[PDB]
Design a protein around this ligand. Structure first.
Ligand SMILES: *[C@@H]1O[C@H](CO)[C@@H](O[C@@H]2O[C@H](CO)[C@@H](O[C@H]3O[C@H](CO)[C@@H](O)[C@H](O[C@H]4O[C@H](CO)[C@@H](O)[C@H](O[C@H]5O[C@H](CO)[C@@H](O)[C@H](O)[C@@H]5O)[C@@H]4O)[C@@H]3O)[C@H](O)[C@H]2NC(C)=O)[C@H](O)[C@H]1NC(C)=O
Ligand SMILES: [Ca+2]
Ligand SMILES: [Zn+2]
Length: 431
């Protein structure tokens, strides 16, 4: 019944700076929610199935907001703890959860931060209200943050989506996975190690393995308790998409937002009467909310306009001149070198490693931890470097080094700009 959680997604100017336009970031937050939507719906939470998410409102900040003296997110150097405290200092009683997306390089390889939920005896996590806390601030602890930059390198959407579900996992009351039964990556068995760790793994994840996409036995039990005790206070029943969330969905022609948010002269905002709200205004044939192939003056862009830039294995996206959406770009040949000759292309996305290009698998070298050591599949004894004589027929003695922000040493840390595998664990006292 009450199985869907209404979200509120914000993006600062650094996130807008990376992607360029408001359409591109909206497509990012749409892709991120649809990612965690499929992960949670296909998870059996002790009998509670088909638990989903939905965006109730967005707030896309541009570089123009960086000069706002009342915007506390404008400072370039903001600590990850204070970044989440800024998100918490807002009233989010109208949303089950509230997230803010950024493109900051947090210290110690931190890719996100969120409050941990609990069935009782502890504040935070999913579905908290705005109340006075110990520090004297009226915070809403139903909040979390995510960043798409780590060690001066952007993280792919495959790892970004999992990180989004990781922090939401804490909001659902799941701690980090512990023990061999819930972290197969550190197991002494080749069968369980190939499947990788789970979503709530406390360290680095690649997203190219089986278990990295779904929760563990440890996490499902912990989340099922928070869902049994907390979701009923805030979740809503599955219904039609709401008008005014800034994303065009099924049943609406356009979607700019509400009155204090719609700057689109071609779309009725959500404050208009039923029958015309989220419906295309007369004389207008599209709205920028539908896609990038629509100008601000609400005309279809020409068949020569470039909508999506050329990626590592995703060709240019050219408009068709008849719809506001952009056609899906055709992918490049598979096993093509991407990410500076470090990874190959798997189904149109830069994933895996360069070892797969020649029928090999990634291995941990014997500081050479940020070098790529390949191995024959199922045989760990053949693990040699790319610049070795074994694979001299494929790599020809060249030594491929891992880019900054890549997993290293059996997913225990990340590589930095000085080619060092720095570990991620951080411990602090409890009150
Ligand atoms: C994206 O850009 C937009 C627009 O540029 C940003 O939106 C702005 O966000 C800021 C903060 O989130 C807003 O700043 C004021 O918001 C309220 C509007 O009146 C103010 O009340 C608020 O005052 C706060 O200041 C202190 C913060 O520590 C605090 O002492 C104040 O006290 C109040 O609350 C305490 C409990 O904490 C209570 O005990 C007191 O009695 C009192 O009620 C209060 O907390 C902010 O000064 C700003 O209005 C808003 N809009 C703008 C600038 O147009 C958005 O943040 C950006 N987001 C990102 C991710 O970049
Ligand atoms: Ca909508
Ligand atoms: Zn975590």
């Amino acid at each position: 019944e009450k199985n869907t959680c209404q979200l509120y997604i914000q993006t600062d100017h650094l996130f807008f700076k990376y992607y360029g336009t408001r359409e591109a970031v909206i497509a990012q937050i749409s892709s991120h929610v649809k990612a965690i939507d499929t992960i949670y719906q296909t998870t059996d939470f002790s009998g509670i199935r088909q638990i989903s998410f939905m965006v109730k409102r967005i707030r896309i900040n541009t570089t123009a907001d960086e000069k706002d003296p009342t915007n506390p997110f404008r400072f370039p150097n903001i600590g990850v703890e204070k970044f989440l405290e800024l998100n918490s200092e807002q009233n989010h009683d109208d949303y089950c959860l509230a997230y803010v997306f950024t493109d900051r390089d947090f210290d110690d390889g931190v890719l996100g931060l969120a409050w941990v939920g609990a069935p009782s005896g502890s504040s935070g996590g999913i579905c908290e209200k705005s109340k006075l806390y110990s520090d004297g601030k009226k915070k809403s602890l139903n909040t979390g943050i995510i960043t798409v930059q780590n060690y001066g390198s952007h993280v792919p959407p495959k790892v970004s989506h999992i990180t989004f579900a990781h922090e939401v996992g804490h909001n659902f009351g799941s701690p980090h996975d512990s023990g061999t039964e819930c972290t197969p990556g550190e197991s002494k068995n080749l069968g369980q190690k190939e499947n990788g760790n789970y979503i709530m793994y406390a360290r680095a994840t690649s997203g190219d393995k089986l278990n990295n996409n779904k929760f563990s036995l440890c996490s499902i039990r912990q989340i099922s308790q928070v869902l049994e005790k907390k979701r009923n206070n805030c979740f809503v029943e599955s219904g039609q998409p709401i008008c005014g969330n800034g994303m065009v969905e099924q049943g609406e022609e356009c979607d700019c937002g509400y009155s204090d948010q719609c700057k689109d002269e071609c779309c009725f905002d959500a404050n208009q009467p039923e029958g015309r709200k989220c419906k295309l205004k007369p004389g207008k044939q599209c709205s920028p909310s539908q896609g990038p192939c629509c100008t601000a003056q609400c005309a279809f862009k020409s068949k020569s306009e470039k909508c999506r830039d050329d990626s590592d294995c995703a060709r240019e996206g050219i408009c068709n001149g008849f719809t506001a959406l952009c056609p899906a770009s055709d992918p490049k040949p598979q096993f093509t070198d991407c990410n500076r000759h470090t990874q190959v292309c798997i189904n149109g996305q830069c994933a895996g490693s360069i070892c797969e290009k020649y029928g090999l698998e990634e291995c941990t070298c014997a500081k050479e931890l940020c070098h790529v050591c390949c191995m024959k599949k199922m045989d760990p004894s053949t693990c040699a470097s790319t610049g070795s004589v074994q694979w001299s027929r494929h790599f020809s003695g060249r030594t491929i080094t891992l880019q900054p922000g890549s997993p290293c040493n059996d997913f225990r840390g990340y590589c930095d700009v000085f080619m060092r595998c720095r570990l991620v664990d951080a411990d602090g006292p409890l009150g």
